[PDB]
Amino acid sequence: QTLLDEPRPGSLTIGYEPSEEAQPTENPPRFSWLPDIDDGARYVLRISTDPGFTDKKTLVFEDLAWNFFTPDEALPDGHYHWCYALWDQKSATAHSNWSTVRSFEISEALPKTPLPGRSARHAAAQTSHPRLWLNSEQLSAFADAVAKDPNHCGWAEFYEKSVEPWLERPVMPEPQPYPNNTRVATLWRQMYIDCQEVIYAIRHLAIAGRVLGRDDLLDASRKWLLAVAAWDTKGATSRAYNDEAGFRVVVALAWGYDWLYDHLSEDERRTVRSVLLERTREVADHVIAHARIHVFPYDSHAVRSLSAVLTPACIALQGESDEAGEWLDYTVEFLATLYSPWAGTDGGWAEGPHYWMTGMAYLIEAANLIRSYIGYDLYQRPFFQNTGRFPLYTKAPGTRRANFGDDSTLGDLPGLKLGYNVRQFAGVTGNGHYQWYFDHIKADATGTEMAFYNYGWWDLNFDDLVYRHDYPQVEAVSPADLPALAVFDDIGWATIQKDMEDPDRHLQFVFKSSPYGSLSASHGDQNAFVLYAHGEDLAIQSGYYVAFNSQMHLNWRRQTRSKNAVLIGGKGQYAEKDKALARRAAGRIVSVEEQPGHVRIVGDATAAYQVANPLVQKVLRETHFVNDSYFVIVDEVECSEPQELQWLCHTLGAPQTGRSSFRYNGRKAGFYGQFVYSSGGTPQISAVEGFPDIDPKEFEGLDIHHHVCATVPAATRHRLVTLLVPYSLKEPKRIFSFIDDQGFSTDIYFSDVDDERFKLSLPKQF
Ligand SMILES: O=C(O)C1=C[C@H](O)[C@H](O)[C@H](O[C@H]2[C@H](O)[C@H](O)[C@H](O[C@H]3[C@H](O)[C@H](O)[C@H](O)O[C@H]3C(=O)O)O[C@H]2C(=O)O)O1
């Protein structure tokens, strides 16, 4: 009987769940632990209300292939205890000391979301092709329906634009390797787009052929499928060379193989399955064995490739490989148990909404396919119940620069897929605000389908068909009753929405101080804010996407100097490629407090600044939303030494600067900021043009943004207070302030022209 290794968790590993430190949000709980030393090992899990773990009251789960698990039945309410051990398969017995006992509590309030076991899952799975989206009877049923009404679920609209143009198009030549094997943005993007079109051709032609009973469309689909199965698996389009191209090729193969299964000949099936299996193997290895996301979960493309690649492929391949059976099980068990590391059940997505767009787009697909293949519904999990509200409060219709993180679209109106995603969650939740969002996004963004981040990723005519065939037709509800404030505690994101339905009065505000630091898609932007008020973008996310690994990306957008945030001694929060440091350079939402006409968020970004500057000791920002009109921002910095303080805000146009203020006027809206109190002395205020140090070529023929730079002279103690008053340009607003400093605390009294007052009571220590 061996000793069990119970390693101490790390910042970039999974944790031990559930515990007193992390109560379960689902019934039955999601169980994860860090693996034993013996990389080839199987586990046994004990659960009991009895702290002594007696037979009568212990549930036992044996032969657990993985170091994470979800039981197939919910638990009765009460106080629980659990522990795990090594399990010897042949001897059918535990063969190591049991783990530390951890405790958790079950209540009736917790969603009941069991995961059907492998036996169940395998037995409910169909064995005949097709399997993806529709099965054999569903196809026949649907085909009869199309014969009766050619516009069923919008079929002919799909046919007209997503099927027909493929008939007159030459089969996509196999993409070439990059000149010198040096990844170039242009060639990398084009290459994955090339492969995306191949998904479209194969998948749409095949579906059409079989829905319409048309041998000529299957032949067109086959011609594409075979040309592709013939591409070099170790060539350019490998996971290794360009995983974006790679992912896509697999998907196409999966669909062609699944829907042309009967149309292919003996060889053609074997030629295809052969090429499909090997390509899927590259991904499956990378995800399970290489990155090992059940240990190191913070891998963007790996996590994503679960739904985007593994799900369609493993379903295609079932019964034709025991590896695929294993891979599917991992994929389903992961999505049910550990998905997603970028989120908690609050619905927020740490990578930002834009990554939420892609991450969900694919999950939806996998969620759907899974539902359709084996009946299991991931949508019942709290996170998916709630996640629809994330783009609602962060990518609200009309907003261009009012959120955070890497954004391919930065500057455009919110992307179509955000709408389309939300509608899916509408369909699942019955929430009409979601259906409102879809409508308005879809409308504001028509004619946009052909942009690289849309065409290169999804076909909306297809996503539309899938939805309309599978889901109810939810009604829109005016977002007027939507609560102003939504806090996303699991990621450290606070948002405010006002009058979302009114383009003159619509306000979007988000403040972010995140325990994810500048890891993956996040930037060095803890204690940062963005402000879209009165129907315009005022305090913006600055710069352009340009390309991943551009200078604009790495030395501007990733950096604090591009945020609405402070600099300390001219230094910002760590935003380089080392992810341990990145995750260490974090902040958090200390507290949120709400009462009529006064919201207050407090963020601690102390760690974030410390990583690059050991002199920093305390970094607090308070943000006040006063009487649904204006903002008071409090910055409190303590160092071990005099350190200069720098306050930044970013705008599209040039800002005008006062002795202790600044003013920006956009096209229909403007705002001003006044530094009313600064314990470190009066700040010198500069307006900076452009993007210093950023290669002028990367934004050539684009509009240069501006930013203000309020600089307080060196001090070991900073207490800065900034009044922010946004306004409709038609109706400019002014707040008056008064300082009652003398005393234990420094008091500041604000009021408007109708003498409605606000009291800021600020202690002198923090
Ligand atoms: O560049 C695009 O055309 C693009 C379109 C999509 O809208 C999406 O925003 C896409 O984002 C991906 C990006 O191109 C890179 O692949 C990047 O990959 C990184 C990865 O996600 C992770 O952060 C880690 O640091 O590795 C990176 C890498 O060098 O590959 O992000 C992609 C993503 O996962 O969204 O950009």
Q: How far apart are the termini? A: 53 Å
Sketch the major β-sheet.
10 strands, antiparallel
CATH H level, superfamily name of the largest domain: Chondroitin AC/alginate lyase
Indicate how many domains the architecture comprises: 3
Q: What is the 3D form?
A: globular
Radius of gyration of CA atoms, rounded to a whole number = 28 Å
Total number of helices = 19
CATH top level assignment of the largest domain: Mainly Alpha
Fold-level CATH name of the largest domain = Glycosyltransferase
Strand elements, count: 25
Structural class: alpha+beta
Which distinct ligands sit in these coordinates?
a molecule of 3 linked components (LGU-LGU-MAW)
What's the helical proportion of residues? 25-40%
Walk me through the structure:
The chain is α+β, with helices and mostly antiparallel strands. It has three domains: 1-117, Immunoglobulins (Immunoglobulin-like, Sandwich), CATH 2.60.40.10; 118-482, Alpha/alpha barrel (Glycosyltransferase), CATH 1.50.10.100; 483-763, Beta-galactosidase, Chain A, domain 5 (Distorted Sandwich), CATH 2.70.98. 32% of the residues lie in helices and 23% in strands. The two termini are 53 Å apart. The structure holds a molecule of 3 linked components (LGU-LGU-MAW). A molecule of 3 linked components (LGU-LGU-MAW) binds at residues 189, 300-301, 355, 358, 408, 452-453, 520-521, 548. This is Oligo alginate lyase. It is found in: Cell envelope. InterPro entries: Chondroitin_lyas, Hepar_II_III_C, HepII_N, Ig-like_fold, Oligosacch_lyase. Pfam families: DUF4962 (PF16332), Hepar_II_III_C (PF07940).
